Amino acid sequence: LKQKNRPNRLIVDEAINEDNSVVSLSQPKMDELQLFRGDTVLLKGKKRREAVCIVLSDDTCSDEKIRMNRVVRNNLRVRLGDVISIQPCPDVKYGKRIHVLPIDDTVEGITGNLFEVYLKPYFLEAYRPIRKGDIFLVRGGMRAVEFKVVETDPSPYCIVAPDTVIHCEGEPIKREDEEESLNEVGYDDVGGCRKQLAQIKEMVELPLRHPALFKAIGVKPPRGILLYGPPGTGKTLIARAVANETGAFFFLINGPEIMSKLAGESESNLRKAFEEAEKNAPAIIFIDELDAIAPKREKTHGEVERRIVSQLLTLMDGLKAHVIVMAATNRPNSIDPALRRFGRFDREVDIGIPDATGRLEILQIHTKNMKLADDVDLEQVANETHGHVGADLAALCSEAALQAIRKKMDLIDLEDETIDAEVMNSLAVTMDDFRWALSQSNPSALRETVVEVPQVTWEDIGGLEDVKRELQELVQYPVEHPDKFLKFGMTPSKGVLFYGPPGCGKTLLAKAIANECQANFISIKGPELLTMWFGESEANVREIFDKARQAAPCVLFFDELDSIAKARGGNIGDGGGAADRVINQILTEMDNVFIIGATNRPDIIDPAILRPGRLDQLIYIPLPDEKSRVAILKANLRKSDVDLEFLAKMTNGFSGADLTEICQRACKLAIRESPVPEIRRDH
Amino acid sequence: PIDDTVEGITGNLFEVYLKPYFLEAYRPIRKGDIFLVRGGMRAVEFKVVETDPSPYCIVAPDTVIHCEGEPIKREDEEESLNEVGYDDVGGCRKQLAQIKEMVELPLRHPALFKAIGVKPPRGILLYGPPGTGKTLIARAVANETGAFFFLINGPEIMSKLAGESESNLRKAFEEAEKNAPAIIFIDELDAIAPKREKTHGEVERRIVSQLLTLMDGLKAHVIVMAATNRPNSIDPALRRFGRFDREVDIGIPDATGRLEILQIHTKNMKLADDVDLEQVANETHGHVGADLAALCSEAALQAIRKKMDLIDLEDETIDAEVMNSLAVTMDDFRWALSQSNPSALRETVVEVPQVTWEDIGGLEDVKRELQELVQYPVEHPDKFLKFGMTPSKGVLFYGPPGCGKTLLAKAIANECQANFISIKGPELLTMWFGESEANVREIFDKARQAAPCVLFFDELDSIAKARGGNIGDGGGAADRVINQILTEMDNVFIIGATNRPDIIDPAILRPGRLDQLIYIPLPDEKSRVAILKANLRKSDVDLEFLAKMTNGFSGADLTEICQRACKLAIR
Amino acid sequence: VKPPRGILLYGPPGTGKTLIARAVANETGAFFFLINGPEIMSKLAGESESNLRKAFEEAEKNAPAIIFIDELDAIAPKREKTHGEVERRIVSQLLTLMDGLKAHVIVMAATNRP
Ligand SMILES: Nc1ncnc2c1ncn2[C@@H]1O[C@H](COP(=O)(O)OP(=O)(O)O)[C@@H](O)[C@H]1O
Ligand SMILES: Nc1ncnc2c1ncn2[C@@H]1O[C@H](COP(=O)(O)OP(=O)(O)O)[C@@H](O)[C@H]1O
Ligand SMILES: Nc1ncnc2c1ncn2[C@@H]1O[C@H](COP(=O)(O)OP(=O)(O)O)[C@@H](O)[C@H]1O
């Protein structure tokens, strides 16, 4: 077979290092290419373009791929996935002169000395290699300025050294059409989502980047991508990035916006919109608040309201260089079921709320243009914003900066004129400023504010009640080896009930098996579900089981199972009996596998229908702590000379895990007030 | 090559198509023949412009093959093979058999009706969930019968301005008649006719009525075919005889049905030898054609992304040879199966076998009371048509939990070739007030359609406990709905219920014409536990007689959990 | 950086929400433009939205400005209480006009509660 060309052709992948001068390869590639830790390289891409960078190693990069930030990627006129060639460039030398100008639409709004505020800091002893025609970004004064290299003395490339003179002759050049602003949405402006982006990326990869493929092929690419998640999750941002990032044409449609046109004038717009997206395909049509246009279920009513949906349905089926449609809503239920009908919005992606790491990520993205004082601890900020979503975090940053602007600059008073760069550049947001902004809180998101972390409680502990791994071996094959069940015909354990009195670590045991086995977790509660109105409660149960299957293998842990299903003799209502029957239909639903772990006081509490084989077939009892078990629970909750933990343990005979955790928490609070553990146990 | 079959590709077809197709097969060809060849994820049509030994000959290893670079244009009367056909439909069979004979005469022998005075079916209604192939079915019957086809889509009609919408319905019907024999397929019908309780609009109503009028206006015949998810959705008016008087329920495929469907959607692609479609078919229980097609499409795109994609030979003018070499692997289907979405309320396996406890040991011999009861009604339906005697209408099954009551009803259905429709009491009662009664009437109606059949209610006592425990406006309405459906009956369809005892069930259910018969079935002895252990451990020191002797008061599920746990511990 | 764009005022009637908004404007040399729900919602269909736009459009001409929508819920109640191929067409219109913002002009609205 005809083999491929030279080995120095790499795919352009994403960057790990946000610096404009570096690109990363893998060590084995650096060898095969004979390149070293800091070697300056010559990068060739499209439209006969080039760039000069510094090459570092990256153990997470693959031999074939090359990591490079959006600045270089643009200087080269390539998109992710594209291929460029790399060649060493040791002949490069120290620069003499350098002429650079700012791109007009990146300095509007400011006045001052950019050289001092931007160039000077940016280059300063970094020895950045630059090729003429390069466009680079510099962040500061709460914004980013774009600069083009108009000419370098040692032409066409050179290194900017402490001696290199830098001219900046006062006239801002106008941007050229094919020169995308870096101030545009990119995958690098999205944090938290990863798996979702991975999916969406591969979904649009071919149709939007390799259209001819479909002219020559007969297979059907996904046609509509539906985005689920609460407000401010970044659905719009995500869609806009994929478009930019893929050179795709973008066209935004907004429900409220469409739904405010006069009857008929509204549909004419939907059509005119679709019609235009096709003119410029490959293109992405993003319908914003979709449910603002298609709710039909039970909430639709209007010889226009209906006439519109239908119009959207028609327009959808009318599709098939491809153009993809992306819509956004808070959840399935909102949307007209018709929009799902295969050839329409046949693909779905649920953008949840970030995890701890996700927020840290998002925080960084929204503070990249501002000067943060050394006391700023974003990890802390990330750690305390549990149920926040990107829109929240962004607002948090915006407020902390405006607060900073009001104390500092503001009181000195140098506003309302034509804001000076140097001023905005010196000002720094302090941890104190983020503290002020955190002061008020508003998002009551129904979920924890911490990503997949650790656990620790009672692993190896003392004598009596040894480790019995019945629950471990049950979810061993299904959760860790999902492909085994695909090739086999045997049925694994569908659901595992957990009989035990209150505070027996039933909820802690299910959450520990999920985190340890890399399975996704989705905690349902019986008191929370029953508190909802008649039949929105059943809508929450179907939305919980559907979300667990999306991130399978998973573990849907029902907390107080008996409050939802007590059929036996205590059940008495048209809504209570409808909720237990909805849980029996969802349990029979199943068969990557997703197990369902319930918990209750005893077998008598739960309904007899829940036991019926295919649902909860397995069972596991778990009781009270002995003497030695109370020693283990006290050490866990007091981890963060006269203190005898063995003595306090011996006196706590019939204590449980929460009793010892309340004895250590009260003992530490009494120490802060002023022996401490004595005061708490005496109350 | 026929031009509209090679657009999109570039490359050497001869190598990619002709060469493989003929290669040592000695295919006989007559001049003017048009033949199809599949590959590179598509099918190319070729016409035989001339053969040396004219007008027919065999293509042998020596036969020279010219392919002079210009693609001829298709001729009107030369239907593309890339068209929907009965061969592009899988799963449905009995439904197609029905529809086929329904349109056979009117669409193929119109004059018959010019000379005759009998009325052919006028409207055919198609029931089934989305992606079942209703549209595909209708489009095929049309093509397959040379019939003229005209598609109408609800959403599409219902988006026109008021009045502009009806003008279209008429213009549509009016055109189907111009080209009759023709088939008019209304797609999402319920998008136009829901009237029941959900209709509301001096336009919404004005449309339905318009459809009704247009329907009655019918009578070379043109047939109307519509599609919806179920009766309930549609306006009852559409049923009124002379309109949609014929109905066909396209269920979800069975195991075999999926295997079939899978094949159809992978005929144009190169599958690696490791691809096991039977496996794929076996694990996609409640899927429907639209699902399976999506599954294939995704497995191929996934394959395209790893292979071709990374080598990178895209965005240009895709070369046949490339697309032709690429092969989807079982690994690719594995990736595509990775996510799942259809929560279809049904099993994912066609009429298969059973096996559990046939001939087994001493004690509790085989008593064929239930066998002889459903012997005459299920196997010999024509006997009851010519006779006046009444067979057993319903057979109750008293017994404690895990007594194989559900396994006994499912075994009598599969063995006697009867259709099965498993209703559950916990599943029906979980539904909202009165959609639960709509599910009970839809279950009994589906069993009569595929009669002889056996509607097996699972936990009968949860639906009907009248005696003294019943207390609700919805619970009493559900038990009365089950008594009206039981009295409904009289090919016969028996109804087999199951409960703990007579005290649990309602006294109204016993009343002769409903559940007249009864059959008690208890616990396993020593020898019975040996039979249940061997059945669940079928798939030298292991003494099955020793484990059986120690399990005194065990049941069938206790021995099946002892063998399943013993095998998991060995792993 | 982005400054707050819409300020919503909660409280029962006669709490001084309008007075508060009018003061902040005067007190800050800002241009003020009052919009009143009942007032907008009494115009003929279409004539009503034309006014919302004409209002927003004017506040921008004289920015920095403050647009105070008085009885807001008289225009945007949608939750479960919205019903009308005009009633809905208006809210949507307000939503559009809102997103259309971004010398800044701030929007202040008043209602009894979320
Ligand atoms: N994952 C995220 N990464 C970065 N910013 C985010 C993210 N999620 C939300 N944001 C921020 O919040 C804003 C959300 O706006 P948008 O995506 O249009 O949400 P919505 O349409 O629901 O109001 C974004 O403009 C962005 O500034
Ligand atoms: N029985 C079947 N055999 C082959 N393909 C099927 C079958 N059922 C569904 N499909 C596939 O799924 C698609 C279903 O489309 P269609 O029949 O128009 O369904 P619907 O109108 O409900 O969305 C078909 O185009 C076909 O590709
Ligand atoms: N906090 C307050 N301070 C001074 N006057 C107030 C205050 N609250 C209410 N008022 C008086 O009551 C009137 C309230 O009118 P307005 O603010 O327009 O309330 P609303 O629009 O709800 O009827 C004001 O005009 C003012 O005279």
Tab-separated table of N, CA and C in Angstrom, chain A residues 11 81 83 202-203 205-206 209-210 212-222 264 267 297-298 301 303 306-307 310-311 313-314 317 338 341-342 344 347 483 486-488 549-552 577-578 580-582 584 589 592 609, chain B residues 7-9 40-42 130-131 134 153 155-156 158-162 187-188 191 198 200 202 204 229 279 283 288 290-291 293-294 297-298 301 304-305 308-310 312 314-318 323 334-335 338-339 343 426 429-431:
chain	number	residue	atom	x	y	z
A	11	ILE	N	-0.713	16.490	13.623
A	11	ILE	CA	-2.059	17.038	13.727
A	11	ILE	C	-2.070	18.249	14.653
A	81	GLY	N	-7.088	19.698	14.439
A	81	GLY	CA	-7.341	18.597	13.534
A	81	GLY	C	-6.527	18.689	12.264
A	83	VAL	N	-3.186	19.629	9.796
A	83	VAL	CA	-1.814	19.171	9.930
A	83	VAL	C	-0.822	20.221	9.491
A	202	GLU	N	-16.639	15.566	18.007
A	202	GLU	CA	-16.589	14.485	17.054
A	202	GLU	C	-17.862	14.428	16.245
A	203	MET	N	-18.953	14.924	16.815
A	203	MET	CA	-20.213	14.905	16.092
A	203	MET	C	-20.173	15.791	14.847
A	205	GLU	N	-17.247	17.171	13.599
A	205	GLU	CA	-15.958	17.041	12.916
A	205	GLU	C	-16.041	16.845	11.401
A	206	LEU	N	-16.613	15.721	10.974
A	206	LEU	CA	-16.706	15.404	9.554
A	206	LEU	C	-17.607	16.284	8.706
A	209	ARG	N	-16.147	19.870	8.667
A	209	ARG	CA	-14.760	20.014	8.244
A	209	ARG	C	-14.452	19.238	6.957
A	210	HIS	N	-15.269	18.237	6.656
A	210	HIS	CA	-15.041	17.425	5.470
A	210	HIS	C	-16.329	17.146	4.692
A	212	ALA	N	-17.318	17.280	1.491
A	212	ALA	CA	-17.244	16.417	0.315
A	212	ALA	C	-17.435	14.962	0.702
A	213	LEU	N	-16.926	14.581	1.869
A	213	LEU	CA	-17.072	13.210	2.313
A	213	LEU	C	-18.514	12.777	2.111
A	214	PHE	N	-19.439	13.626	2.528
A	214	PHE	CA	-20.855	13.309	2.424
A	214	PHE	C	-21.440	13.442	1.030
A	215	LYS	N	-20.689	14.075	0.142
A	215	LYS	CA	-21.127	14.201	-1.241
A	215	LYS	C	-20.812	12.842	-1.890
A	216	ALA	N	-19.707	12.240	-1.461
A	216	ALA	CA	-19.251	10.957	-1.977
A	216	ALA	C	-19.763	9.760	-1.190
A	217	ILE	N	-20.245	10.011	0.019
A	217	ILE	CA	-20.703	8.924	0.861
A	217	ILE	C	-22.227	8.860	0.943
A	218	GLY	N	-22.742	7.793	1.545
A	218	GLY	CA	-24.175	7.635	1.663
A	218	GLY	C	-24.678	7.571	3.092
A	219	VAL	N	-23.776	7.754	4.055
A	219	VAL	CA	-24.141	7.710	5.473
A	219	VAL	C	-24.693	9.056	5.960
A	220	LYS	N	-25.498	9.018	7.014
A	220	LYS	CA	-26.095	10.230	7.555
A	220	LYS	C	-25.404	10.729	8.822
A	221	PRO	N	-24.965	11.997	8.822
A	221	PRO	CA	-24.298	12.575	9.987
A	221	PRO	C	-25.370	13.069	10.949
A	222	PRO	N	-25.036	13.258	12.238
A	222	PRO	CA	-26.084	13.744	13.147
A	222	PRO	C	-26.609	15.073	12.593
A	264	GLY	N	-46.932	35.399	11.654
A	264	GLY	CA	-46.538	35.263	10.262
A	264	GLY	C	-45.169	35.882	10.031
A	267	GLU	N	-42.635	33.460	11.512
A	267	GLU	CA	-42.214	32.292	10.746
A	267	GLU	C	-41.338	32.701	9.568
A	297	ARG	N	-46.245	20.066	24.218
A	297	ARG	CA	-46.699	19.038	25.164
A	297	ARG	C	-48.137	19.217	25.668
A	298	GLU	N	-48.313	20.137	26.608
A	298	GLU	CA	-49.617	20.441	27.181
A	298	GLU	C	-49.746	21.963	27.245
A	301	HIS	N	-50.719	26.587	22.931
A	301	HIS	CA	-52.075	27.072	22.691
A	301	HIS	C	-52.077	28.369	21.882
A	303	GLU	N	-53.291	29.632	17.495
A	303	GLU	CA	-53.298	29.416	16.053
A	303	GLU	C	-52.065	30.039	15.395
A	306	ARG	N	-48.841	27.323	17.592
A	306	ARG	CA	-48.738	26.013	16.953
A	306	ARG	C	-48.201	26.126	15.519
A	307	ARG	N	-48.651	27.155	14.809
A	307	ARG	CA	-48.227	27.381	13.436
A	307	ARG	C	-46.704	27.589	13.344
A	310	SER	N	-44.750	23.888	14.213
A	310	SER	CA	-44.894	23.163	12.961
A	310	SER	C	-43.914	23.693	11.942
A	311	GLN	N	-43.792	25.009	11.882
A	311	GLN	CA	-42.873	25.653	10.954
A	311	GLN	C	-41.431	25.198	11.243
A	313	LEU	N	-40.568	22.423	12.824
A	313	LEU	CA	-40.489	21.012	12.479
A	313	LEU	C	-40.208	20.893	10.981
A	314	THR	N	-41.048	21.523	10.162
A	314	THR	CA	-40.874	21.500	8.712
A	314	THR	C	-39.464	21.899	8.338
A	317	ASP	N	-36.861	19.049	9.140
A	317	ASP	CA	-36.917	17.968	8.155
A	317	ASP	C	-36.412	18.422	6.791
A	338	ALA	N	-41.965	16.291	19.306
A	338	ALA	CA	-41.795	16.209	17.861
A	338	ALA	C	-40.377	16.541	17.421
A	341	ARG	N	-38.086	13.361	17.207
A	341	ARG	CA	-38.248	12.487	16.044
A	341	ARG	C	-36.973	12.455	15.212
A	342	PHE	N	-36.221	11.382	15.407
A	342	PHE	CA	-34.957	11.127	14.739
A	342	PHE	C	-34.348	12.212	13.856
A	344	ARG	N	-34.473	14.939	13.227
A	344	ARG	CA	-34.472	16.302	13.725
A	344	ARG	C	-33.397	16.421	14.802
A	347	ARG	N	-29.694	14.013	18.527
A	347	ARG	CA	-28.566	13.901	19.445
A	347	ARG	C	-28.785	14.833	20.629
A	483	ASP	N	-17.917	-3.576	28.779
A	483	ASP	CA	-17.827	-4.324	27.523
A	483	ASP	C	-18.041	-5.831	27.705
A	486	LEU	N	-21.717	-6.583	27.194
A	486	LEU	CA	-22.091	-6.407	25.791
A	486	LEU	C	-21.839	-7.673	24.969
A	487	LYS	N	-20.772	-8.396	25.305
A	487	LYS	CA	-20.397	-9.624	24.603
A	487	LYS	C	-20.995	-10.879	25.248
A	488	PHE	N	-21.521	-10.740	26.463
A	488	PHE	CA	-22.068	-11.867	27.219
A	488	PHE	C	-23.591	-11.800	27.288
A	549	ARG	N	-28.205	7.057	33.082
A	549	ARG	CA	-27.939	6.228	31.905
A	549	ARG	C	-27.055	6.956	30.891
A	550	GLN	N	-27.147	8.285	30.869
A	550	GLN	CA	-26.334	9.110	29.977
A	550	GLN	C	-24.856	9.067	30.364
A	551	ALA	N	-24.588	9.044	31.668
A	551	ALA	CA	-23.222	8.981	32.190
A	551	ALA	C	-22.903	7.599	32.768
A	552	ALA	N	-23.408	6.551	32.118
A	552	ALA	CA	-23.171	5.175	32.555
A	552	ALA	C	-21.747	4.739	32.188
A	577	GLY	N	-49.619	6.551	45.044
A	577	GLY	CA	-49.654	5.276	44.330
A	577	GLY	C	-49.151	5.423	42.894
A	578	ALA	N	-49.278	6.628	42.340
A	578	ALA	CA	-48.763	6.931	41.003
A	578	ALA	C	-47.243	7.117	41.004
A	580	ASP	N	-45.112	5.401	43.255
A	580	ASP	CA	-44.538	4.078	43.493
A	580	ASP	C	-44.587	3.220	42.231
A	581	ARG	N	-45.643	3.394	41.437
A	581	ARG	CA	-45.784	2.708	40.154
A	581	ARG	C	-44.829	3.280	39.106
A	582	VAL	N	-44.465	4.552	39.262
A	582	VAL	CA	-43.492	5.200	38.381
A	582	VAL	C	-42.067	4.742	38.688
A	584	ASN	N	-41.451	1.666	39.856
A	584	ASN	CA	-41.433	0.262	39.452
A	584	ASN	C	-41.288	0.125	37.937
A	589	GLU	N	-37.264	-0.681	33.654
A	589	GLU	CA	-36.609	-0.093	32.487
A	589	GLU	C	-35.236	-0.442	31.929
A	592	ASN	N	-23.343	0.233	28.718
A	592	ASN	CA	-22.848	0.343	30.084
A	592	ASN	C	-23.996	0.252	31.084
A	609	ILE	N	-43.480	-4.929	45.817
A	609	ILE	CA	-43.269	-4.898	44.368
A	609	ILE	C	-41.820	-4.571	44.001
B	7	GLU	N	-22.475	10.337	-8.225
B	7	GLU	CA	-22.237	11.719	-7.867
B	7	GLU	C	-21.643	11.587	-6.483
B	8	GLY	N	-20.786	12.513	-6.090
B	8	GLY	CA	-20.208	12.428	-4.767
B	8	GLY	C	-18.883	11.702	-4.691
B	9	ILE	N	-18.661	10.706	-5.544
B	9	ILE	CA	-17.385	10.001	-5.503
B	9	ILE	C	-16.499	10.264	-6.701
B	40	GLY	N	-17.963	0.968	-0.638
B	40	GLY	CA	-17.616	2.325	-0.243
B	40	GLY	C	-18.773	3.070	0.390
B	41	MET	N	-19.615	2.320	1.102
B	41	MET	CA	-20.799	2.844	1.792
B	41	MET	C	-21.794	3.526	0.859
B	42	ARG	N	-22.170	2.802	-0.188
B	42	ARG	CA	-23.117	3.283	-1.182
B	42	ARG	C	-23.259	2.214	-2.266
B	130	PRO	N	-42.558	5.942	17.237
B	130	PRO	CA	-41.716	6.595	16.232
B	130	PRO	C	-40.573	5.696	15.753
B	131	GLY	N	-40.156	5.908	14.505
B	131	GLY	CA	-39.068	5.136	13.920
B	131	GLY	C	-39.361	3.660	13.746
B	134	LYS	N	-43.154	3.149	9.470
B	134	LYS	CA	-44.467	3.363	8.890
B	134	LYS	C	-44.353	4.084	7.540
B	153	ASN	N	-47.365	15.840	5.365
B	153	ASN	CA	-46.847	15.820	6.720
B	153	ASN	C	-47.575	16.818	7.627
B	155	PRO	N	-47.067	18.441	10.685
B	155	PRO	CA	-46.328	19.641	11.062
B	155	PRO	C	-46.226	20.589	9.879
B	156	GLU	N	-45.921	20.020	8.726
B	156	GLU	CA	-45.785	20.767	7.491
B	156	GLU	C	-47.080	21.498	7.090
B	158	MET	N	-49.760	21.994	9.083
B	158	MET	CA	-50.114	22.816	10.233
B	158	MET	C	-49.236	24.043	10.493
B	159	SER	N	-48.385	24.399	9.544
B	159	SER	CA	-47.522	25.553	9.711
B	159	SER	C	-47.900	26.608	8.680
B	160	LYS	N	-48.812	26.248	7.782
B	160	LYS	CA	-49.269	27.179	6.765
B	160	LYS	C	-50.225	28.109	7.484
B	161	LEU	N	-50.486	29.273	6.902
B	161	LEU	CA	-51.401	30.227	7.516
B	161	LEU	C	-52.815	29.630	7.490
B	162	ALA	N	-53.702	30.131	8.348
B	162	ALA	CA	-55.078	29.630	8.384
B	162	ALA	C	-55.691	29.744	6.982
B	187	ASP	N	-48.362	11.828	7.100
B	187	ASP	CA	-47.369	11.438	8.071
B	187	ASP	C	-47.798	11.465	9.532
B	188	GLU	N	-47.613	12.593	10.194
B	188	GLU	CA	-47.945	12.640	11.604
B	188	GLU	C	-49.402	12.943	11.937
B	191	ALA	N	-51.127	15.285	14.144
B	191	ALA	CA	-50.666	16.670	14.086
B	191	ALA	C	-51.750	17.470	13.373
B	198	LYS	N	-58.373	17.248	23.035
B	198	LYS	CA	-57.256	18.150	22.759
B	198	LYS	C	-57.414	19.145	21.607
B	200	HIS	N	-58.781	22.469	19.730
B	200	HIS	CA	-59.236	23.800	20.127
B	200	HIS	C	-58.725	24.880	19.174
B	202	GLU	N	-60.634	27.695	15.896
B	202	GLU	CA	-61.511	27.924	14.754
B	202	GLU	C	-60.783	27.656	13.435
B	204	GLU	N	-57.992	24.941	13.778
B	204	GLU	CA	-57.624	23.581	14.131
B	204	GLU	C	-58.785	22.652	13.769
B	229	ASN	N	-49.021	7.204	16.585
B	229	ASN	CA	-48.495	6.309	17.603
B	229	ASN	C	-49.557	5.368	18.149
B	279	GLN	N	-25.197	-10.741	17.750
B	279	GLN	CA	-24.897	-10.242	19.091
B	279	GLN	C	-25.559	-8.874	19.204
B	283	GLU	N	-28.531	-7.784	21.865
B	283	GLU	CA	-28.522	-6.850	22.989
B	283	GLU	C	-29.364	-5.587	22.868
B	288	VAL	N	-36.047	0.119	17.816
B	288	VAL	CA	-36.898	0.131	16.629
B	288	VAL	C	-35.973	0.503	15.478
B	290	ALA	N	-35.463	2.909	13.464
B	290	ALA	CA	-34.793	4.202	13.486
B	290	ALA	C	-33.570	4.145	14.397
B	291	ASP	N	-33.688	3.353	15.465
B	291	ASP	CA	-32.611	3.152	16.439
B	291	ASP	C	-31.466	2.380	15.801
B	293	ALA	N	-30.784	1.862	12.740
B	293	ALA	CA	-30.162	2.591	11.635
B	293	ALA	C	-29.173	3.609	12.181
B	294	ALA	N	-29.571	4.267	13.262
B	294	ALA	CA	-28.729	5.259	13.897
B	294	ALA	C	-27.491	4.573	14.461
B	297	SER	N	-25.154	3.869	11.508
B	297	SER	CA	-24.614	5.131	11.044
B	297	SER	C	-23.516	5.633	11.962
B	298	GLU	N	-23.721	5.475	13.267
B	298	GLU	CA	-22.739	5.920	14.245
B	298	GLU	C	-21.481	5.049	14.291
B	301	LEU	N	-19.490	6.039	11.224
B	301	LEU	CA	-18.837	7.341	11.340
B	301	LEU	C	-17.675	7.249	12.329
B	304	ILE	N	-14.872	5.727	10.553
B	304	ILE	CA	-14.316	6.725	9.645
B	304	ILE	C	-13.422	7.703	10.380
B	305	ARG	N	-13.757	7.982	11.636
B	305	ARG	CA	-12.968	8.914	12.437
B	305	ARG	C	-11.640	8.343	12.947
B	308	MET	N	-9.509	6.235	8.351
B	308	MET	CA	-9.385	7.318	7.382
B	308	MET	C	-8.985	8.646	8.035
B	309	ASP	N	-9.885	9.162	8.871
B	309	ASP	CA	-9.735	10.430	9.583
B	309	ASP	C	-8.331	10.804	10.046
B	310	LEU	N	-7.688	9.933	10.820
B	310	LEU	CA	-6.351	10.235	11.315
B	310	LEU	C	-5.278	10.194	10.217
B	312	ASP	N	-5.958	10.979	7.411
B	312	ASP	CA	-6.421	12.242	6.840
B	312	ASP	C	-6.412	12.393	5.323
B	314	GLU	N	-9.614	13.614	3.798
B	314	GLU	CA	-10.968	14.146	3.723
B	314	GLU	C	-10.995	15.594	3.247
B	315	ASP	N	-12.208	16.123	3.084
B	315	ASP	CA	-12.422	17.489	2.606
B	315	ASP	C	-11.647	17.731	1.302
B	316	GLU	N	-12.179	17.195	0.201
B	316	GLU	CA	-11.563	17.326	-1.118
B	316	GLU	C	-12.538	16.846	-2.200
B	317	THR	N	-12.608	15.527	-2.336
B	317	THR	CA	-13.464	14.829	-3.292
B	317	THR	C	-13.168	13.350	-3.037
B	318	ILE	N	-13.725	12.838	-1.940
B	318	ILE	CA	-13.530	11.459	-1.479
B	318	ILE	C	-13.344	10.348	-2.527
B	323	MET	N	-12.772	4.772	0.674
B	323	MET	CA	-14.007	4.408	1.340
B	323	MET	C	-14.273	2.919	1.256
B	334	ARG	N	-19.244	-1.614	19.046
B	334	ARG	CA	-19.205	-1.627	20.487
B	334	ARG	C	-19.232	-0.193	20.947
B	335	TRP	N	-18.418	0.630	20.305
B	335	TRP	CA	-18.358	2.029	20.659
B	335	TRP	C	-19.734	2.678	20.514
B	338	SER	N	-22.229	2.048	22.967
B	338	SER	CA	-21.814	2.403	24.306
B	338	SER	C	-22.758	3.200	25.131
B	339	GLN	N	-23.649	3.947	24.465
B	339	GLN	CA	-24.547	4.850	25.193
B	339	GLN	C	-26.043	4.641	25.478
B	343	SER	N	-35.877	3.439	25.991
B	343	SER	CA	-36.432	2.743	27.146
B	343	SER	C	-37.786	2.136	26.786
B	426	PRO	N	-48.535	-3.197	38.806
B	426	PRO	CA	-47.743	-2.096	39.360
B	426	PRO	C	-47.395	-1.060	38.289
B	429	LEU	N	-50.840	0.934	37.391
B	429	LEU	CA	-51.287	1.796	38.485
B	429	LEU	C	-50.341	2.980	38.711
B	430	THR	N	-49.116	2.874	38.189
B	430	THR	CA	-48.133	3.952	38.301
B	430	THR	C	-48.454	5.123	37.367
B	431	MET	N	-49.237	4.861	36.323
B	431	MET	CA	-49.651	5.899	35.378
B	431	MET	C	-50.636	6.872	36.022
